[PDB]
Amino acid sequence: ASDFQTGIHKIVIQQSGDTDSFEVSVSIGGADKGGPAKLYNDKGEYIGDSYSAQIRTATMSCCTNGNAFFMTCAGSVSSISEAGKRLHITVIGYIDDKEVNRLEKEYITDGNTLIETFSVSTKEI
Amino acid sequence: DFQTGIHKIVIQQSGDTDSFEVSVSIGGADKGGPAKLYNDKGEYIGDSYSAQIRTATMSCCTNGNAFFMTCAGSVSSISEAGKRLHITVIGYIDDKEVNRLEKEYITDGNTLIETFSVSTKEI
């Protein structure tokens, strides 16, 4: 329980590289003491208590209300492109604007089918 | 072409279920983006799903074009000591078991908060 903090949990995702050569999808959720966490987009609009999206812009973010104690982002990155295409993915997890975890990924296609996955959360590792 | 199939996650809980709050978030992927999700009856439930689990079992699956599924769970309790929860999570691709998680949670008087994660993918 000490690994969890109640507050506004947030995930920010940024991508760079040969973005048209890769499909990047994420699923985001969290929890509060009563159920799945309510989720909000970068403008603060309510988007439900589950969320998935293909990443098609440079930056996306998702946050909770202030009752959440946990938030997770699971993603997949795939490509059937020719060898030598490159993607960078950064996923940052915050609680009340403090960075609590970060994933940095670099992908480069080798001519075979590329399928990779990742996960990050706001739990203390 | 990607190696695809029906990805499926099954969750089973038991014990002092009224003493625990169990939340799950489920999603998957195919070459188009997030995978459509279906319940145990084959009904479309969205391309994202979350629930407070209040039954003994639940399942979620994709159609045959998925290459990834994942389930993130939270278990919490503010109950007295000695309440017990068993969780089994099983992941399949084309009904072949590819992953599993088994957990037993027992309260000790303090606030209990634990999380879990189970994914399905080809290796």
Whether the CA torsion A89, A95, A97, A99 is positive or negative: it is negative
Q: Which amino acid is at A77?
A: V
Q: Which of A85, A88, A60, A25 is nearest to B32 (CA)?
A: A25
8 A C-beta contact, residue B105 and residue B114? yes
| Residue of B1, B20, B50 to mutate, interface with A, max A Cβ within 10 Å | B50
**What's the gap between Cα B30 and its chain centre?**
18
Chains A and B form CB pairs within 8 A to the count of: 113
Residues in chain A with CB shorter than 8 Å from the CB of B50 are 29, 36, 49-50
Residues in chain A with CB shorter than 8 Å from the CB of B31 are 23, 78, 80
Cβ neighbours for B89, distance < 8 A, ≥ 6 positions apart: B9, B10, B11, B12, B71, B73, B100, B101, B102, B116, B118
8 A C-beta contact, residue A80 and residue B2? yes
Spatial distance between the Cα atoms of A17 and A25, rounded to a whole number of angstroms: 16
Spatial distance between the Cα atoms of A34 and A104, rounded to a whole number of angstroms: 32
Tokens 């940095």 correspond to A104
CB atoms B2 and A80 under 8 Å? yes
**Which 8-state DSSP code applies to residue B55?**
S
> What CATH number matches the domain at B1-123, 2.60.60.60, 2.160.10.10, 3.40.50.150, 1.20.120.1200?
2.60.60.60
Characterize A69-82 residue by residue with b for buried, 16 or more Cβ atoms within 10 angstroms of its Cβ, and e for exposed: bbbbbbbbbbbbee
Query: How many C-beta neighbours within 10 Å does residue B47 have?
Result: 23
Q: Where are the domains of chain A?
A: 1-125
Approach to solving: X-ray
User: Resolution to 1 decimal, in Å?
Assistant: 1.4
Q: What is the dihedral of CA A41, A44, A50, A55, to 10 degrees?
A: 0
Q: What is the dihedral of CA A32, A69, B114, A30, to 10 degrees?
A: 60
Q: Which amino acid is at A21?
A: S
**What's the gap between Cα B94 and its chain centre?**
17
Spatial distance between the Cα atoms of B66 and B89, rounded to a whole number of angstroms: 19
- Domain A1-125: which topology? Lipoxygenase-1 (2.60.60)
B121 touches chain A (CB under 8 A): yes
| Residue of B39, B74, B75 to mutate, interface with A, max A Cβ within 10 Å | B74
Cβ neighbours for A15, distance < 8 A, ≥ 6 positions apart: A22, A24, A55, A58, A87, A88, A89, A90
Query: What values do phi and psi take at A98, rounded to 5?
Result: -90, 130
